[PDB]
Amino acid sequence: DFHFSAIFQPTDPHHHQTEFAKVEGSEKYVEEVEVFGRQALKVNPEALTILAHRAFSDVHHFFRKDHLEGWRRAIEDPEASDNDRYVATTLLKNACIAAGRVLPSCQDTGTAIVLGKRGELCWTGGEDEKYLSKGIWNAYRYHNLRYSQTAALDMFKECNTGDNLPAQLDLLAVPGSDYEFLFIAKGGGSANKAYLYQETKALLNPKSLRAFIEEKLKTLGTAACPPYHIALVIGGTSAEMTMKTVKLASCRYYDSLPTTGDKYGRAFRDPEWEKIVMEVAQKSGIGAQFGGKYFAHQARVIRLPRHGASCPVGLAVSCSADRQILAHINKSGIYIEQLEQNPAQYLPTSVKVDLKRPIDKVRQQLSQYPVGTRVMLNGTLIVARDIAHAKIKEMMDNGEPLPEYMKTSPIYYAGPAKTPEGYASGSFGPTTAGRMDSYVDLFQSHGGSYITLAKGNRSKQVTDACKKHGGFYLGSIGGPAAILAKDSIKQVTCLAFPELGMEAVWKIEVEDFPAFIVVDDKGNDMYSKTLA
Amino acid sequence: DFHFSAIFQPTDPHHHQTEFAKVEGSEKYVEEVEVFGRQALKVNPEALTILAHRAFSDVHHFFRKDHLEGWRRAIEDPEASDNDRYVATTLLKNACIAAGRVLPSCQDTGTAIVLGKRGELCWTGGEDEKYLSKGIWNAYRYHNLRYSQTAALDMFKECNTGDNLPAQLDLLAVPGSDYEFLFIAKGGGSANKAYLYQETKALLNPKSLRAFIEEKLKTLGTAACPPYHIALVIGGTSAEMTMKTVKLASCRYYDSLPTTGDKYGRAFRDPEWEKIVMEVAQKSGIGAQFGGKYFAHQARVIRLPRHGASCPVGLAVSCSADRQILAHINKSGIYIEQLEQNPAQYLPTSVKVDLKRPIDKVRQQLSQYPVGTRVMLNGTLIVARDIAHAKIKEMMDNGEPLPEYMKTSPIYYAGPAKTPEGYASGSFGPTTAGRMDSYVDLFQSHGGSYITLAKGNRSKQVTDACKKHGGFYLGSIGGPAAILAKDSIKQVTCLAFPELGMEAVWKIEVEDFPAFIVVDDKGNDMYSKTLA
Ligand code: SF4
Ligand code: SF4
Predict the structure, then answer these.
(1) Taking the CB of residue A425, how many other CB atoms lie within 10 A of it?
(2) Are A225 and A321 in contact (CB under 8 A)?
(3) Where along the sequence do coiled-coil regions lie (chains A, B)?
(4) Cα–Cα distance between B48 and B112 in angstroms, integer?
(5) Do A305 and B35 touch (CB under 8 A)?
(6) CA distances (Å), A277 to each of A207, A398, B62, in order?
(7) Cβ atoms of B175 and B119 closer than 8 Å
(8) What is the spatial distance between Cα A46 and Cα A30, in angstroms, rounded to a whole number?
(9) Which residues, numbered 375 to 394 in chain B, qualify as contacts with chain A under a Cβ-Cβ cut-off of 8 Å?
């Protein structure tokens, strides 16, 4: 006989476990009505604008308890490494500055993603995408955020959209008369650490699955600012369904799923394998960015049904900029998830490097120290990331020289958020180093980029280049963009390619800028043991 | 200054270019009403059951014109290889059998996927997933299809759901009062050939993108029954959005997108790079499964916006079992895409191998011929695929011998659809060989699986195993499950593991079963040059 079984059967489908605050007076935007014997809700679409604006504003200044608890856990655990505690302390202090509501917690204020669930009898007028986008436009336009969306004018010619649009708007049709939401301000770095694997039945035994987890977790590296929320999805009805599921799992959206399967193929959370993932993460030694125990905050493992011929697998993280907000509109008005507004309650030996000298003198000083040495940088950084590197390579391919500004100073891979009025800099932390790896040997061979500054482990070609050319790669802490802006960055100037927005070349003056020597000029790599 | 721009702006959003048929009398399921000044449509949810039942029945017996035209092109093109023409003729003859409405075109009748777009004022009662699932249940229960879904009772313990449920039900909230659908009966083999790559700005130039396409197309190999509809998506707002987009592109759902980008980041189809994909596919020499020009029917390339730090890329195919159906419900009733009911209008030596001999004598005969030799098999095949291979390896890990029935006959990797009344067998084509690669050396070392029969290129370990043990891998044509059942398969009996259903070990008798020698007993592989 026919028996319908929904794949996802959360015991808390409306997220009653979350605390919400009502937007004051927002009941003026809704009206409960009764049509053809059923309860319906008229919603002024302006409510969607109000809600998206507040959500994509608040989420940049506050965090969830389970995120903050993880940093405090990394500080208080006796088994944490010194680097574990240093990174976690820095990120918590960063969260305290972001809670001042001026600087966002990360310079990468993310892609705006909306998961919406509009009830059959929730009536908005139907222009939901436009009104949601206007609220997002408002949040990024009128706050000290960043325009991160790159439009393709043709296959290769690109420009910044200048407003952080378009958003990803996934609006679903569901029963009832309410409107439920998950808003995600998704950073590019953690979005890049969402992986799809095509596997087989040969994986589905304890030994093979454990080895698989050990292998794949290492490929995450430190490039998305751990401690991670690690999500793992085994199975799925299609690649895109698996990847949607691992995204939502990383947002703890499926925490209330059943924990056992059944003959109808329902999804379930697997706490036993979450514990195994956490054991792999801890024993890896990768740590909170620079070696230790706190590679991961927590783990979510969801087992899904599969076509007999198929076994898609998804792996994804939520990064230090852990930014999602639940919300709903009902007959009483607009409700938005309450984040922690007082992160301070969760709070329970370096080499001074003067950059104000010839770059060869800085290289000689750095050459005296092993990888893993904590440094503090004082002086000028030249800022350049993906597009500027591509333009400079193209210039050199046409016979033009490597520009002078790639030869005078360490290269900081970064793109700033907008500068608050009266501030020296907006949030201005690093971007992922690995994306620039293909340029390092080329640029060093042409007399520049000897010292680079960013975050994440890099490929072997960069280790070889630094040894061949006497270069260095310095790893900044990943994520603490607001405290770096408040305490370290003293002057910001646009140097070249202003049309690229945040991806322009910048010249900045910094003081007390912390970093680790990750790659030296001798073939050493402080990630060589944990990530290889 | 705010301008809303939807990412996807098809010029034919309601698919007017597609021909639809009305379900007779279906206007009885809908009623136009007016509520708060707005036009709404009441839809009896039984309409969803009727529509899903007809869609997931019809799609297994008929094809779209552009699919059939591609097979005809492979026969009539002077540049098609002889093997191109042979394969395309076989697939067209298979489609003629399937159009008889008894045998489905492929034994893998797929995962049932519904993309639904319910208007704000389309009122179904809200139980859409149950009623859609009942229609899907009806189609797979009451027709000669296959139950292909595998439930996870725990992480590793699995069972078949016995009804091809659960479906993938992606129901979206959209403007208006209609209900629009794309139904996809997605085979597992092509679902497995959906890949996500995390790339960078360094890819976004003509030389790098061309080399990337050349590299990735080869990794598709022949294991998903080409000629392929190849879809490539560059960019996207998230991994899951990229993979959803490449899925829909492969179904030609986005054919009416604009062909230029703009400063707002709208998606566009790129005809120039579609031509380049087709040039790469044709010049690859991979061909329609066995060498030649017709690796691909056609190509779709969508360029998407991206976060500056991100460049997700999706690559996916639609296989020979190209199965999708558009539909909509409106004030006039239920409309469903009209597929081609007369595929015959598109229609314009070998070595006899007796399998009824000692397996060692069959090995000696096969040893006389080079790879690429076409053979015609007559006799017994022992049928076993993923689950049976895993269970047999598990038995051996527990000290049990390889069963005798794995040593007497060639091993056919396949799983049959249900047997029509009065037929010797239901549709019964091959399964992808690569998924069994990890078993071959082990099984041959214990005296069995010397000759295997399936589809697709295999890994080096199988070539090395066949050379070490005097084995062979034979490639059946991929896809022609109905004509194989009708013409070649004369008897089917369950031999072992009846509890596994479709994945039990079968003993079948075949006549005039065509295959190519893909791997011989000498280290040769007919794909070594095209898939190097
Ligand atoms: S915390 Fe790190 S990975 Fe996350 S958005 Fe910010 S820079 Fe990117
Ligand atoms: S056997 Fe071939 S045609 Fe059939 S679903 Fe699998 S890949 Fe597609």
Answers:
(1) 25
(2) yes
(3) none
(4) 14
(5) no
(6) 13, 49, 46
(7) yes
(8) 10
(9) 386-387, 389-390
**Do A427 and A144 contact (CB within 8 A), yes or no?**
yes
Chain A residue whose CA is closest to B122: A120
Resolution given for this structure, in angstroms: 1.9
Q: What is the length of chain B?
A: 532
Is the CB of residue B203 less than 8 Å away from at least one CB of chain A? no
Tokens of A404: 């002078």
Give B423's contacts (C-beta < 8 A, 6+ positions apart): B102, B103, B485, B486
**Within 10 A of B324 (CB to CB), how many other CB atoms are there?**
23
Q: How far apart are CA B235 and CA B305, in angstroms?
A: 6
Q: How far apart are CA A435 and CA A221, in angstroms?
A: 13
**A with B: how many residue pairs have Cβ under 8 Å apart?**
360
**CB distance A509 to A491 below 8 Å:** yes
CA B280, CA B277: separation in Å to the nearest integer?
5
Distance CA A342, CA B470 (A): 71
Q: State both tokens at A14.
A: 């409306």
Mutate to test the interface with B, among A44, A109, A238, A317 (most CBs of B within 10 A): A238
* Residue A389, min C-alpha distance to chain B (Å): 9
**C-beta separation of A256 from A302 below 8 A:** no
Question: CB of B427 within 8 A of CB of B481?
Answer: yes
| E strand or H helix at A376 | strand A374-383
Write out the two tokens for A302: 């969801």
B146 annotated among ligand-binding-site residues: yes
The angle, 0 to 180 degrees and rounded to 10, between the axes of the packed helices B271-283 and B206-220 is 50
**Cα(A274)–Cα(A298) distance, integer angstroms:** 8
Q: Is B289 in the pocket of ligand 2 (CB under 6 A)?
A: no
Q: Is A5 on the interface with B (CB under 8 A)?
A: yes
Does any ligand 2 atom lie closer than 6 A to the CB of residue B322?
no
Structure tokens at A436: 């620039």
Query: Do B45 and B131 contact (CB within 8 A), yes or no?
Result: yes
Q: Tell how far CA A272 is from the center of its chain.
A: 27
- In B433-492, the residues whose Cβ lies within 8 Å of chain A are 435, 438
**Can you tell me the distance from the alpha carbon of B249 to that of B237, in angstroms, rounded to the nearest whole number?**
16
Window 84-103 of B: residues touching A by CB (8 A cutoff) are none
Which residue is closest to A234 within chain B, CA to CA?
B155
With beta carbons less than 8 A apart as the criterion, state whether A25 and B22 touch. Answer: no
Are the Cβ atoms of A129 and B4 closer than 8 angstroms?
A: yes
Interatomic CA distance for residues A504 and A511, integer angstroms: 22
- What is the rounded CA–CA span in Å between residue B107 and residue B145? 7
Which tokens in the block code for residue B316? 């996916």
A398 Cβ contact list (under 8 Å, min separation 6): none
A258 burial level (CB within 10 Å; 0-12, 13-18, 19+): middle
| Structure-token match 């198929």, residue found | A310
What are the angstrom distances between the C-alpha of B348 and each of A415, B88, B91, B294? 61, 11, 13, 17
- What is the full DSSP assignment across B80-147? S-HHHHHHHHHHHHHHHHHTTSSS-SSS---EEEEEEEEETTEE--S-HHHHHHHHHHHHHHSSS---
Domain boundaries, chain B: 1-186+322-348, 187-321, 349-532
- What whole-number distance in Å separates Cα of residue A480 and Cα of residue A477? 7
């895993």: which residue's tokens?
Answer: B390
What's the Cα-to-Cα distance from B308 to each of A105, A109, A185, A454, B199, rounded to whole Å?
Answer: 18, 12, 14, 16, 12
Tell me the shortest Cα–Cα distance from A80 to chain B, in angstroms. 31
- In terms of phi and psi (left: phi > 0; alpha: psi -120 to 50; beta: otherwise), the region of A440 is alpha
Under 8 Å between Cβ of B361 and B408:
no
Q: B464, B483, B377: which is closest to B425 by C-alpha?
A: B483
Q: Which residues pair with A496 in a beta bridge?
A: A505
